[PDB]
């Protein structure tokens, strides 16, 4: 079968800014298992009906996993914009594949506060689709060069998702996995049972 376990049952997901990229090929994938993640979870699919994914066949499948805030999950979609969409993760408009998001407040929350999840807040421009920016240089918002001091008009690009179980549903952590399929001239190999 396919390693959809090490991608959906991993202990820790990567940060949204430095999101993970996993190649999947030469495997038999049973997507129905993905319906038991939570009683109520987001399962949007673009360009393909979910009920007809165990009968089609692709060349490769790309899995991208991260953790984002609850109210920001609507930004992971083609044609959207906001903070995560253009600074951390940009989805191309000509996208086929599925996004699976579910609440994980029981696994990624600390009473003291989880500071291990980071997101970029300042960038010179927007992000091209499927691009990663892992730089950490100080950002000069104004005209005066500060050369690496966090004073006025010089903020650190990254902030932290201080997750706590006391927060509301709109601030609780959400685990997101995006599966991308594509067709090429090569024969299909990643098929359902």
């Amino acid at each position, epitope marked *: 079968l396919c390693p959809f376990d090490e991608v959906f049952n991993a*202990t*820790r997901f990567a*940060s949204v800014y430095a999101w993970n990229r996993k190649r999947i090929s030469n495997c038999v994938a049973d997507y129905s298992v993905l319906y038991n993640l939570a009683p109520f979870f987001t399962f949007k699919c673009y360009g393909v009906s979910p009920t007809k994914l165990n009968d089609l066949c692709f060349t490769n499948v790309y899995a991208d996993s991260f953790v984002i805030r609850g109210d920001e999950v609507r930004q992971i979609a083609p044609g959207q914009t906001g903070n995560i969409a253009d600074y951390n993760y940009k989805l191309p408009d000509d996208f086929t594949g599925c996004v699976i998001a579910w609440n994980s407040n*029981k*696994l990624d*929350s*600390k*009473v*003291s506060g989880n*500071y*291990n999840y*980071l997101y970029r807040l300042f960038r010179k421009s927007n992000l091209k689709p499927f691009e990663r920016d892992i730089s*950490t240089e100080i950002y000069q918002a104004g005209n005066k060069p500060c050369n690496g001091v*966090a004073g006025f008009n010089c903020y*650190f690009p*990254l902030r*932290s998702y201080s997750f706590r179980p006391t927060y509301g549903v709109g601030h609780q952590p959400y685990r997101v996995v995006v599966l991308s399929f594509e067709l090429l001239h090569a024969p299909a190999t990643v098929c359902g049972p």
Partner: antibody, heavy 121, light 108 residues
Framework: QVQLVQSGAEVKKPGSSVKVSCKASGGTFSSYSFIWVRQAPGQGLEWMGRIIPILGIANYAQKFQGRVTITADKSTTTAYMELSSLRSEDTAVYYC??????????????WGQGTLVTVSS | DIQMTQSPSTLSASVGDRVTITCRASQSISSWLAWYQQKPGKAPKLLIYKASSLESGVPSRFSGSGSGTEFTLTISSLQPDDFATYYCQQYNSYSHTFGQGTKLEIKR
């Protein structure tokens, strides 16, 4: 991977303050978090505080509030712990520990050799 | 504050056996727990964090398991290098408390 070096043994009077330095080498230095632990010669470990140098948040134990501070210096790539109002029950071996953004910022991955601090007359 | 208790405080074993140590928390700490092994006089070394995840470089014979307010650590094939003192540490809510510290010694 990462090598941590601590200062020498310290012998101080009760009415003083002590500054212990911890130098780290290895990897990008802005992804690390610094934790400080203490071990009395007659008992086990005890946690004091944790600093995130790059996010600028420092949190100490409730008991040691107003008595200890933990800072870091980016250019020297070091951390410092200042303990004030030393008491005869505060003699112990101090350990510098470093978490990591990818792993966890609260756990301790690499440990220093520790410094022996004795406070008496 | 959350108080941690270890059992048994004093343990005896021999080379080749399978051993286990239990660590119980006063309150719910979710699944945040870490285990360290300190030799006499040396600096402690991390073994397990997240109560299930194994730290890289540690031999695979160590295995942790637990969900809430009760956790266990197990050694399958004990070795002469495994004689040391093992400490718990939870990092849920501030003032991260350690445990008593179980010392595992040979059988005379």
């Amino acid at each position: 991977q990462v090598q941590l070096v601590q200062s020498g043994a310290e012998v101080k009077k009760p009415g003083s303050s002590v500054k212990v330095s911890c130098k780290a080498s290895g990897g990008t230095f802005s992804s690390y978090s610094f934790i400080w632990v203490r071990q009395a010669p007659g008992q086990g470990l005890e946690w004091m505080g944790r600093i995130i140098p790059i996010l600028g948040i420092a949190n100490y134990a409730q008991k040691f509030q107003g008595r200890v501070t933990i800072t870091a210096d980016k250019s020297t790539t070091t951390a410092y712990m200042e303990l004030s109002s030393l008491r005869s029950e505060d003699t112990a071996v101090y350990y510098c520990a470093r978490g990591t953004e990818y792993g966890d910022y609260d756990v301790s991955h690499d440990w220093g050799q520790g410094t022996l601090v004795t406070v008496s007359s | 504050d959350i108080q941690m208790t270890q059992s048994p405080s004093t343990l005896s074993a021999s080379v080749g056996d399978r051993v286990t140590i239990t660590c119980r928390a006063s309150q719910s700490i979710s699944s945040w727990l870490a285990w360290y092994q300190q030799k006499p006089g040396k600096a402690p070394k991390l073994l397990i964090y997240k109560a299930s995840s194994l730290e890289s470089g540690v031999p695979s014979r160590f295995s942790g398991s637990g969900s809430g307010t009760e956790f266990t650590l197990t050694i399958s094939s004990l070795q002469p290098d495994d004689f040391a003192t093992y400490y718990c540490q939870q990092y849920n809510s501030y003032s991260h408390t350690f445990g008593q510290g179980t010392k595992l010694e040979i059988k005379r």
